[PDB]
A paper describes a structure:
pmcAquaporins (AQPs) are integral membrane proteins facilitating the flux of water (orthodox AQPs) and/or small neutral solutes such as glycerol, arsenite, and urea (aquaglyceroporins) across the lipid bilayer of cells. The human genome encodes four aquaglyceroporins AQP3, AQP7, AQP9, and AQP10 and recently AQP7 was identified as a novel regulator of breast cancer. The model shows the typical AQP fold with six transmembrane segments and two half helices located on loop B and loop E. Furthermore, the conserved aromatic/arginine selectivity filter (ar/R) and NPA-motifs (NAA and NPS in AQP7), characteristics of the AQP family, are clear in the model.
Here, we report the single-particle cryo-EM structure of human AQP7 at 3.2 Å overall resolution in complex with the specific AQP7 inhibitor Z433927330 (4). As seen for AQP7g, the AQP7 with inhibitor (hereafter called AQP7i) adopts an octameric configuration with individual glycerol channels forming two adhering tetramers, which interact via their extracellular C loops. An unambiguous inhibitor density is observed in the glycerol channel, showing an extended shape with the kinked end exposed to the intracellular side. The inhibitor fits into the glycerol channel of AQP7 by binding near the ar/R filter (composed of Phe74, Tyr223, and Arg229) and extends to the endofacial side of the pore. The ethyl-benzoate group is accommodated in the wider pore area in the vicinity of the NPA motifs (Asn94 and Asn226). Further toward the intracellular side of the pore, the ligand forms two hydrogen bonds via its urea NH groups to the carbonyl oxygens of His92 and Ala91, situated on loop B. Closest to the cytoplasmic side of the pore, the phenyl pyrazole group is accommodated, and the nitrogen of the pyrazole ring hydrogen bonds to the side chain of Gln183, which likely positively affects the specificity and affinity of the compound. In particular, two residues located at the intracellular vestibule of AQP7i, Arg106, and Phe187, display significant shifts in comparison with the AQP7g structure, resulting in a wider channel at the intracellular side to accommodate the inhibitor. The Phe187 side chain rotates approximately 90° to avoid steric clashes with the inhibitor and instead it forms a CH–π interaction between its phenyl ring and the carbon atom of the pyrazole ring of the inhibitor. Permeation analysis revealed no water permeation when the inhibitor was bound to AQP7.
Author numbering:
A (entry chain A), B (entry chain C), C (entry chain B), D (entry chain D), E (entry chain F), F (entry chain G), ...: 26 to 278
Amino acid sequence: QEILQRKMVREFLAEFMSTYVMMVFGLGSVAHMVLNKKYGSYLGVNLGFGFGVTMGVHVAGRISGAHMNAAVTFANCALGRVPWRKFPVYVLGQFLGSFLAAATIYSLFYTAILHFSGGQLMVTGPVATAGIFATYLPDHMTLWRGFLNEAWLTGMLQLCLFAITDQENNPALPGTEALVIGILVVIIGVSLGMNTGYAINPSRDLPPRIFTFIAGWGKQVFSNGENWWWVPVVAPLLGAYLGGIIYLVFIGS
Amino acid sequence: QEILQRKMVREFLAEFMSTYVMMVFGLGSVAHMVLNKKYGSYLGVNLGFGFGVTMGVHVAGRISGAHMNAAVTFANCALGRVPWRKFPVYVLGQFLGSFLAAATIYSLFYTAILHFSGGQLMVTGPVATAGIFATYLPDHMTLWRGFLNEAWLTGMLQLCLFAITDQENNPALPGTEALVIGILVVIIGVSLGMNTGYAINPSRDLPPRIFTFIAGWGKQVFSNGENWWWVPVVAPLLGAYLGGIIYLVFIGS
Amino acid sequence: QEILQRKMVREFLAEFMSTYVMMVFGLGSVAHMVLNKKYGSYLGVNLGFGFGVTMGVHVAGRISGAHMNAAVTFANCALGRVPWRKFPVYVLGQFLGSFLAAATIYSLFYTAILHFSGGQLMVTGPVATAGIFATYLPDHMTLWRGFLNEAWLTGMLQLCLFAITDQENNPALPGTEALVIGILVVIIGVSLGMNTGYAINPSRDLPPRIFTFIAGWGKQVFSNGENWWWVPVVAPLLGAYLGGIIYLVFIGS
Amino acid sequence: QEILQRKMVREFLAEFMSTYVMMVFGLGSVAHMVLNKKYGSYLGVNLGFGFGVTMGVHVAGRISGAHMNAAVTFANCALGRVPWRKFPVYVLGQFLGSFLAAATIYSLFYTAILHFSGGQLMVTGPVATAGIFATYLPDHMTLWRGFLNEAWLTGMLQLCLFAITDQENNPALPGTEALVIGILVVIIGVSLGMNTGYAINPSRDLPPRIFTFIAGWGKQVFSNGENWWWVPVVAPLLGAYLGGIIYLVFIGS
Amino acid sequence: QEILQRKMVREFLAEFMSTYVMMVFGLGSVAHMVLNKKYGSYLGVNLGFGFGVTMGVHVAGRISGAHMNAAVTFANCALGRVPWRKFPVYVLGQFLGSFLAAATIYSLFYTAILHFSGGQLMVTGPVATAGIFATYLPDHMTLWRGFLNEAWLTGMLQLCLFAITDQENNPALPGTEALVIGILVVIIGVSLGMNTGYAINPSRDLPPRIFTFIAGWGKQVFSNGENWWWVPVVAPLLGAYLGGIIYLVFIGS
Amino acid sequence: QEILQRKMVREFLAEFMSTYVMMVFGLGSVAHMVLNKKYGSYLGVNLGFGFGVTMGVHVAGRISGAHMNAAVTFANCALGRVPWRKFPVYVLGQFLGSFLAAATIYSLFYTAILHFSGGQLMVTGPVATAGIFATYLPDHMTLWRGFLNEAWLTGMLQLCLFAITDQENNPALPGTEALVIGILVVIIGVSLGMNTGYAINPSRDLPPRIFTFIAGWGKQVFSNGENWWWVPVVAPLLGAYLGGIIYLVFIGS
Amino acid sequence: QEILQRKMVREFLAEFMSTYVMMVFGLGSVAHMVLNKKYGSYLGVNLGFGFGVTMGVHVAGRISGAHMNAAVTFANCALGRVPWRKFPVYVLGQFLGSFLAAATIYSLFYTAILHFSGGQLMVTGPVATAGIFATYLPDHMTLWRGFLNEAWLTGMLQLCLFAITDQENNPALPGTEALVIGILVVIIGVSLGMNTGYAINPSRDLPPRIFTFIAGWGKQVFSNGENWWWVPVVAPLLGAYLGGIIYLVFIGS
Amino acid sequence: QEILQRKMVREFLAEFMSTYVMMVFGLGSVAHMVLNKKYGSYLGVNLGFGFGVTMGVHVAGRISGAHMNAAVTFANCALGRVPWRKFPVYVLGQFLGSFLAAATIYSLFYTAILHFSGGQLMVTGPVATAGIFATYLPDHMTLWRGFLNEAWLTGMLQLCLFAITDQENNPALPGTEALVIGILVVIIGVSLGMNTGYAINPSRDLPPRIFTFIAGWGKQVFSNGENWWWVPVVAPLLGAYLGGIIYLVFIGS
């Protein structure tokens, strides 16, 4: 038990658990929306994926701040708030948590997925089920506009997160920040979601895609949409950095 | 009035009242969803059954902690937080409250039930009404996968309820814990509900089934779904124990 | 301005304004649900009529407690919390506020009502519009069962209101009671609403009916449903008294 | 950086950013409702446009109070709370923020707008898209009744926003005012929205209309509905002034 | 084989076979309309029950004229066209054919009926299946108005049958009368069908009702609708007699 | 019985009966389409109103030719085929038959009309029932365009009826002309019907309107649609005359 | 060209062409019903099959009688009407015609099939397309009941075909038999079709199944439904023989 | 009037009138299907466009045979049945008739077209109206497959027309050929219509396209779908020639 005494292990485990819980809730809501129409709705996805973040923040608040997203960690490290030493640990914890959450969601809804798909797993089609785990580019939307959407959404998320938590300007009452963050995520999903699925998280996107690829959806997951997989990994970092810079320069003294 | 002075009677009455109120709200929402399509929706069931737990916590907060679920009481007693002496009292109070709540819900919606069913009470069918009181296994889902779903959902519920209330790590602001618990139950219902009805409560499941059996739905309530009735009584205990152990070992110092 | 200095006038004006605001919001939500199907839903009615109570409590909190319901005032006066001297003043304020709110709602949605009804105002029918202002008994539901439903709902409301506000047992955090009361009203509407429209308020029911009768819907508003109008005036008083007695005897020490 | 030290520049930038964020969220929700029916609903618009005001208040709370609406600023200046010197600065900041938010929303949803409209931009019609940015008068509703609706809604908004914030009577708990304000806006949209789109904000209305006019929707945006554009600029000022006067005279000592 | 040489036996067998075929087609169309909505429509029932008469006329044209209806036989016998000696033979043949056709239709659609009803056979209800074999009075329609409808429809049918076949006035081209009669029945069903199911045939109505009663639908088939069963047995006789009298007196020289 | 010997009385009775039967079938189909959506469709109206003409032609073929339409009689008289002496007799017979058919249709569907309308008879509205008997101008269509539509449709009907019956060019096989005429009316209704209801018959239009006016629909039947009632009385005469002239000049030698 | 002079070659070619045309029309109607919901309906399939049989009868009437079905040929040969020498020639012609018709239908609707199925050909599933060519047993219906349905339908078809064509009893007018046969097939499809797809033709069933098997739907076409493929090959022969025997013994002298 | 005596003028006028009537009926049915969904269906289009051909055949039967299609005329002239001298006259008559029919249909449905399109005429889009007059290639279907479909459909039409009319083999009863031809066209539309709109007529396709181009739909009518306009002008000629050759060689002695 001597390993668990170190603070690095604690900051790894807290991130792992919080990301796992949030991803489980989000993927469950998405599966409900996709598979069964009677029990699913877009507002259900928004509520689940917004108030799962709240539970993750509650779980891993003091230990590591509950980043739960690699773009937020990159933005914090670039601004000097968090040293670069802890970046790989947070990234590994988030990736492992998301991968295990995707595995759990696949395990729970196995029979429903088989019944809906008819036994054949298709990435794209009328009965496609690969969109539950990772986001895919719609038909009308293009690649670079998707890049713009991802970067812009991540920028707004980072600016709002800076505004809510900042103690100098107008912080939320302590102990109620999780509800405000959850409502922020909910309204982000409601208002700016249909264009690209509002990924704005490399941890939410890549590990589920890898899990589907090794589970059996095939190599079409990467090559679909003119190699769309790398956009959610690149755009959010720049978006979050720009949003933090804008907030700090303008409103943050 | 000398009987009411004893603390055991108080801890019995508080549990009885809180469980009664929560079960009344939940069963009313379920009946609204089942009977009338215009006035019912899945989100309505989630909201009612999540924010009735908030009222129950408010009613029976200080006296006994408002366990309102036999799985939570078993998990607390196994970890030494609550002595084993008070377990039967809590179980009896919860069972009586749930039974009376089911009776009240049956009394209120009698004419609507008769009109919808046409006068014949059927456990399974196009106009089945036995699913209002207790959960039943869907067609595609099997028994052991239902056991897994129940155990996993109860484990997640226990882990989240332990994280929210824990004073050392990151407790919610006192006086606002009921809202957070209600939102947790709402998102659990939204995200992980369609597989088995998210029973995760022996008190919510068994007494309504017994009430239907003695009211006249017949003995088909127990034998349906390869004797499904015992799964919600066994799985949540193990799920809650495992969730509490995991949280205590990893995150709770 | 010497009249406004007296406390009686202030406690009358506060009740008038709070009841007016709450009734305006509730009737607007009901009109949205009834007239236009695209912009209306049952959940919209529940949210509007639940969180209008919150705004009324905020407006008239300290001056008079924001009873906004004759049943609550009668229950408080019968238990000795409020002297009988202030009962007529509160009743008159609530009645005037509700009547003016009904008049305002009629004034705002005049063209939409005329377009939907085709120019003819009918109490009952496929294009009936008299149900916006007052509740009417459904076809399957009978008179005495409606009396039972009204009394039971008012009793549950009074018990929950006692539980939430009581300082000794487990009060909500001060400054956040309005949100909890609004959520309570929302879940009451969601869970126990389709049977009779969850009137549980003489002030919400009678003055709008009188306004419709003098506006031109005819005398059919009173005689419809075997003289249903007197049930919402009688049942809630007994329901609230019984709920308060039960809470005080069992849980409130 | 010497310019940013002055308080006037700070009060300009805070208003600009808060109005920009709120308008972005509101227009995104409206576009979701209009373009795609599966991902859009009226409740989504209400939630987005209500809880965007919460984030705006959080962003620009201490610096300038987050007026975010010219009617509120005019009402405050007329009552002497805010000097007339700061009115033009606030108005310019709000106008610029709203114009840039409309431009951003147009940039993000360009392909979806082209696909839905078929390539032709029409102010009025079965595939009209000019209603995303600015509100337009419905067919049954007339001009002066729209004026009445706008003034009345702004009056109720001002009275409630004067109640939730007043420290003497019954203020909300500090740090939680943003949630209550957001819920107020949500219920306003739910209850009193279908008549005219509940503009009640010159900044929310005029700059998007100007942006559409210069973007290419034509000059039909102004002349439509018997020159409806000037009503949202005139009615809210009188409505807010009357609401503030009523609250101050009656309930505010 | 000496029995089959007699003309009475031949005129009995022809009626039996023709009535059997027509009833089989009609009941099959009705079952398609009732059970499966995708494969059923009112126009399908009209076409089947109209062009089954054509096939029956083709089968039993020369031997006995293909009366296939006790009302037509009674009308012909009362006018002296057919002697009273052959009335019981025709009635017995029609009754036996209709009973066997109902038995065959019950045998073919057994599994579909069990699946649709859930295993319980109900005369009236949301999943009622007793209406496939015999007609039942709707909720809004009364007994004596049903008598009037039946008599009037039978009178119109008899007048049109007299007009089509009459050689003196304007007979249809020989060999094509069956198509015209089928189209007449189709348009009768289309134009005057929703009030009472356009029974206008004792042979089409009573034997299926008796078959359901002995098969297990219970004694509710006779007592339903204020003893509706005797109206289709009495009204068509008077209707057909009056129609024939009117045609002969006015148009038929 | 000496009166019935005269040929004038015979032709009068034949026209009366044929028009009565055709109008009964057409109005029954229209009532089915209007009142009940499950049992009604536009194709049902077309088939009923097309193959009722066939039955009328069969009934009154040799005696008078079964004009059943004042426009056809006027066109025949203007061309010298029929002397002007018999025009008033035919017109009176058609008018009386149509009036009695409207009365019969009103008598049969009385309860259904009362249930659908809620007890109030409205010429125009969401539950209007005056359109069953007579045609009314739609909202988008204007008066003179309706005149053009009526005249053009009557012209095409006259040209086709002249071509079908003409013995010199290419007559249909005798005894099958009724089916061809019915199919012609059906396709006219299918192809050119939604603009004005394809009245093209003064006898089909005016007497039902008069019957509704005296039955209680009020004087709004005449004044509706800028006095639309006179167009179906004037346009078909000119249309039929022009069609007959065109056919005779160009194709009929 | 000396080969074409022989009567055997002519009786082969006529059967080939008629079966080809009828199968093409039927499969086109089925594909329209299955693929596109807007352009497809069950009544369309019924009309296509019936009036394609009509066209086949017109094409191959005098040369060979247009059997177009192996059951009819077997029934005729067993009764001595057709010698056994011509049975193999007719069977081969029908099989070749049906196979080529299936190939043509596959060639025409290739892109639509690929678009609907998403590129994957599945025998059973939500996007199954193997049912266009051959009939498959529904879920509720069993094997032996399907055998009974097929035999009974073929018996009724044979009895009606004997009745229509028989010159002694009541033949249809020569030159109009094709319309009557088409209407018979249409009403058979309307009344007795949903149970098993009313195959009642080995030539209509087996060759399309073989074509799908060699085209790429796999070997699941034969093994599906407990080896359902042999029922349409065996049942119709017995059904047709029994129907012919019954008609000849009872009605056919 | 000396011009009308010549047989060439008669063969021009008969073709003109018959084509005009058939095109009017077909375009009216198509407009009903496209504009109003309540009054339009695919089966309506099939019935109208099939039984308009019947009326055209009746009108112009003896004078010129009622070719009404340039493909049929070319096929007849190539086989020597009709001399090449009369080909240009028939083509000109058909073209003029179709152009005037398109003009008439545009004149009748002007207000409905403007209301549906919103005032803007678009060839392709959600509110496109250019498809009423001429057929356009669907999205999934390609150019050469459309050529194949057109040629194949015209071939089947020509083969069936040869079979129906041929006196030696099995002609339809004289005077009833029009009904059989109409049913043939109806089933062609039902079975093989959704791929390309079953143009199979240059006269039905090109003149309406030219009329739309000069009326104001723009030059996009020709360039749409990779210059689709020339396929309906080329494919039907080859299809009809091949069908006639096949019928003459194989079945026609």
